[PDB]
Symmetry: D4
Subunit: 159 residues, 8 copies
C-alpha cells in the first residue's frame, strides 16, 4: 500500500505526459505517489523530497520536466535511489533541450533517461517495474505477462 | 562471484568508453561479466545473450554502442531485466546519432539511457549499483560511502 | 504472383507513411507483401522474417520505423537481401531520430536509406523497382514509362 | 571484366572515403569503374555519364560527395538504374550537410543513402553486392561467405 | 518587357513560397518569368534553361526548392549569371535540409542564399533588384523609394 | 574589498573558461569571490551559497558549467539576485547541451545566459559590470573607458 | 514615473511574445516604455535609441527579435546599459536561429539571453527587476513577494 | 583602380577565411578594398561605411563574420547595394551560429549568403564577379574563361 515509486513532475503542464507513467504503474498494481515538484520554483521542496525518499520506503523515482529540465538530475543529487528522467516535449525545441538537460549528467550522479514525451513516461514506469521485479516475484510475473501481451498483440499486417 | 550485471558492447572500439563502467562495478565490488556482442554482426548471439540473462542470474544489463546504436534496444527487446544504454561517441556526429538511436525507444521497451561517452558508462555502472543496492544492504552502504566521498572530495575553490 | 518485395513496418502508426510504398509497387505491378513487424515488440518475429526472406523468394525488403528506428538495420542483420529503410517522421524530433537510427549503420551491414516520411516510402518502392528491373525486362519497361511520365507531367509554370 | 558498378565522386578529396567502396567491390570480385565527376564543375559530364550508364552495362551506381552533395541526386535524375549515395564527411558540419543533401530526395527520384564517411562507402559497395547477388549465384555465394565470416570474426570479449 | 529575372521552382508546391518573389518583382516593375523546373524530375529542362538564360537576356536567376534542394546549385552549374537560392520550408526538417543543400556550395559555383521560406523568396527578389539597380537608374530610384517606405512605415510602438 | 560578485563553477575543469570572467572583474576593479560549487556533487553547498548570497553582500552571481549544466539555474532558484550563466564548452556536443541546459529556464526563474566558452565568461563579467555601474559612478566611468578603448582599438584593415 | 526599463522588439509580430515582459514589469510597478525598433528596417532609430538610453534615465533594456535576431546585440553595441535579449520563436527554426543570433555574442559586448519565447520575455522582465532591486528597497520587497508567491503557489500534486 | 567591391570582416581572425575572397577578386582583376569593421565594437564605423558605400562607388559588399554574425545584416540595413555574407567558421558551433545569424534575414533586408568558411569566401567573390560581369563585357569574358577552365581542369579519375 505504501508507495515504492515516486512520480514527480516540474508542473501541472507536464501531467499530460507523466499521466502515462501513472497509468502504467497502476496497471501493474505498483503502489506509488504522484506529485508536482519544481526544481526552480520549489527547490527546498525538491531537496526535502529527494533526501527523505529512501527513508519513506521509495525504491525508484520517476522525474519529468521540460526545457532546462533539471528536476531529474537535482533529485538524483540528493538521493541514492535510482532516478529515471522523462524529457517532456517543449514547445519550441520539441524536448531536445529537455533531453540534453537530463541525459548529459556528468559522471557521479546518474539519471536513467527515457524517450521524449509520452513514450518515455510510459517506459519510465516499465523500467521502474523491471527494477522492482528483481525482488518482487508476484510483480515479476505480472510484468512478464504485460510484456508477453504486448508482443502477442502486435498485428501481423496493417489495417 | 556469479555475475549480477552484464556489460556488453558492439565492438572493441567501444571498450575505451565502457571500461569506465567495468572499473566502477569492480570498485563497488559488484560481480559482473564484460562481453562484445554485435547487434548487426552477431544478432543471434545477442538474442541468446539477452533471452537467457535472467535465468543466468543477471539483474541488470549495461549495453554500449555508437552510431546507429541498436545493441541496447534489441537487448531490451529480448530480456525482461532493466537495460541501461551508453551512447558511445561517434566520429562525425559526436554521439548524437548514438544518443537518439538509444534513448528514443517507443513505448513498451525501455532503455535507461546515460550521457554520451565516459561519463555515461560510469553513470550506467552507478545506476546499476543504485538498483542492486535496493536489495543488498552491504552494497547500499558501499554506494552511500562512495556518494558521500564524492561530495566531500569537491574542492571549495579552483587552482587559478 | 509470389511476393518479390516485402514491406515491413514497426507499427500500424507507420501505415500512413508506408502505404505510399505499397501503392507504388501495386502501380508497377510488383507482387509484394505488407506486414507489421516490430524490432522491439516482436524481435523473434523479425528474426524469423529476415532469416527466411530469401528462401521465400523475396528479392528486396523495404522496412519503415520511427524514433529509435532499428527495424531496417536488424532486418539487414539477418538477411543477405538488400534492405531499404524508410525513416518515419516522429512526433517530437520529426524523423531526425528515425533517420540517424537507420542511415548511420556501421560498415558490414547496409541499409539503403530514403527520405523521411511519405517521399521516402514512395522512393523505397521505386528503388526496389529499379533493382528488380535489372533482371525483369517487362518491369524495366514499366519503370521507364513511369519515370518518363513523371518527367513529362511536370508543368512548365505554376498555377 | 566489363564494369557492372560505377563509383563516382565529386573530387579527389572524396577518394579517401570512396576507396573503401572500391576495395570492397574488388574483394567480392565485382567488376567496376571509378571516376571523378563533379555535379557543379562538370554538369554535362555527369549528365552524359548517368544517361549512358545502363546502355554501357552498369547495373548500380555508387556516388559520393560532401557539403551540398548533389552528385548522387543528379545522377539518379538521369539514370533509371539504382543509385546509392555516400555522404562524405565535411569539415565544418561533419557530413550533416552531406547527409541531408543526399537522403532528402523528394518522391520520384530515389537515392539509397548510406552512413557518413568510410562506413557508408563500404556499405554502399556491400549494398551494391547484395543487389547484384540477386541474379548472380556465384556472387551470392561469395557475399554469403563474406557475411558469415564477418559474423564468425566477432570476438566474445574485449581486450581490457 | 523581356524578362531580366527568371524565377524557377522545383514544384507547384513551392509556389506558396515563391509567389512572394514574383509579387515583389512585379511591385518594382521588373520584367520577369516564373517557371517550374525540377532538378530531379526535369534535369534536361533545367540544363537547357540554365545554359540559355544569358543568351535570352536574363540577368539574375532566383531558384527555390525544398528537401534535397539541388535546383539553385545545378542551375548555377550551367550559367555564369548570378543565381539566388530560396530554401523552401520542408515538412519534417523545416527547411534545414533545404538550407544546407543550397548554401553549402563548394568553392567555384556560388548560390547567394536567402532565408528559409517566404522571407527568403521576398529577399531574393529584393536582392535581384539591388543587382539590377546597379545599371538601371529608374529601377535604382524605385528600389530606394521601396527601402525608404519600409523604414518609414515601421510603427514606433506595438498595438 | 568585500565581494559584490560571486563566480561559481561546477568543477576545476571549468576554470580554464571562467578565469576570463575573474580576470575581467579584477581589470575593472570589481571585488569578487571565485569558488567551485557542484550542483550535483554538493547540492547543499549550492543551496546555502545561493540562499545566503544577498545577505553576504553579493549583488550578482556568475555561474559556469558544462554538459547538463544545472548550476546557474539551481543557483537562481535559491537567490533573488540576478544570476548570469556561462555555458562551458562540452567535449561531444561542443557546449550545445551546456547552452540549452542553461538558457531554457521556464518562466519565473531567470538566468541571463552568455556565449559558449571564453567569450561568454568574459561577457558575463562585463554584463555584471554594467549592472553594478548603474549605482556606482566610479565603476561606470571605468566601464565607459573600457568600452571606448575597445572601440578605438579595432584596426581599420587586416594583416594580409 | 519616468521609464527605467526599455522594452524594444523588432516588429509588431514579436508583440505576442514581448507582451509578457510588459505585463510582468507593470505587475511589479516598474515604470517602462514599450517600443518597436527594427535593427534592419530602422537601423538609425536603433542607434539613436541605444545611444541616448542612459541619458534618458533607462537602467536596463529588454530587446526581443526572431530569425537573424540582431536587435539585442546591436543595441548593446551602442549602450553601456545591461541589455537582455529575448529570442522570439521563428516559424521554421523555432527560435534556434533567434537564440544563436543573440547568445553567441563575442567577448566585449554582452547580451544576457533568456529562453526562447514567452518564458524568456517574462524572465527578461524578472531579470531586469532583480537588477533594479539592487538599488530600490521597495521594489526589492515587491520582487521578494513575487518570488515567494510563485514558490508557495505551486500545487503539491497534479489535477 | 577605384574599388567596386568592398570586403569587410569583423576581426583579424576572420582574415584567414576572407583572404580567399580577396585573392579571387584580384585574380579576376576586380578593384576592391579590404577592411575590418566590427558591428559590435565599431557600430558607427559600420553605419558610415555601409551608408556611404554607393556614393563612394562600391557596387557590391562582401561581409564576413563568425558566431553571432551581425556584420552582413547590419551592413545591408544601411546600404541599398547588394550585400553578400560569408559565415566564418566558429570554434564551438562550427559556423552554424554564423550561418543562421547571417542567412535568416527577415523580409525587406537581403543578404546573399554563401557557404561556411573558405568556400563561402571564394564563392562570395565569384558571386560578386557574376554581378559585375552583367555590365562589364571585359570582366564577363574573364569570368567565362575562369569558369570554363575550372570545368576543363576536373580530372576524370582519382589518384588511388
Ligand atoms: N525544469 C523545471 C523546473 N521546474 C519546472 N520545470 C519545467 O518547466 C516547464 C514549464 O512549466 P510551466 O508550464 O508551469 O511554466 C515544465 O515542463 C517543467 O518540467
Ligand atoms: N522502432 C520500432 C520498433 N518497433 C516499433 N518501432 C517504431 O515505434 C514507433 C511508434 O510505434 P507505436 O505507435 O505502435 O507506439 C513506430 O513509428 C515504429 O516504427
Ligand atoms: N529538389 C527538387 C528538385 N525538384 C523538385 N524539388 C523539390 O521537391 C519538393 C517537393 O516536391 P513535390 O511536392 O512536387 O513532391 C519541392 O519543394 C521542390 O523544391
Ligand atoms: N531581426 C530583426 C530586425 N528587425 C526585425 N527583426 C525580426 O524580424 C522578425 C519578423 O518580422 P516581420 O514579421 O515584421 O517580417 C521579427 O521576429 C523581428 O524580431
Amino acid at each position: 500500500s505504501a508507495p515504492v515509486v515516486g512520480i514527480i513532475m516540474g508542473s501541472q503542464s507536464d501531467w499530460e505526459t507523466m499521466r502515462h507513467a501513472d497509468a502504467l504503474l497502476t496497471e501493474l498494481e505498483i503502489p506509488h505517489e504522484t506529485l508536482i515538484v519544481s526544481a526552480h520554483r520549489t527547490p527546498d521542496r525538491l531537496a526535502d523530497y529527494a533526501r527523505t525518499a529512501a527513508e519513506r520506503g521509495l525504491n525508484v523515482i520517476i522525474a519529468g520536466a521540460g526545457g532546462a529540465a533539471h528536476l531529474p538530475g537535482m533529485c538524483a543529487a540528493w538521493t541514492r535511489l535510482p532516478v529515471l528522467g522523462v524529457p517532456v516535449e517543449s514547445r519550441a525545441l520539441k524536448g531536445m533541450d529537455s533531453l540534453l538537460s537530463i541525459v548529459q549528467m556528468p559522471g557521479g550522479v546518474p539519471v536513467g533517461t527515457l524517450a521524449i514525451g509520452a513514450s518515455g513516461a510510459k517506459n519510465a514506469a516499465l523500467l521502474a517495474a523491471s527494477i522492482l521485479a528483481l525482488y518482487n516475484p508476484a510483480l515479476a510475473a505480472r510484468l512478464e505477462t504485460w510484456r508477453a501481451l504486448q508482443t502477442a498483440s502486435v498485428p501481423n499486417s496493417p489495417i
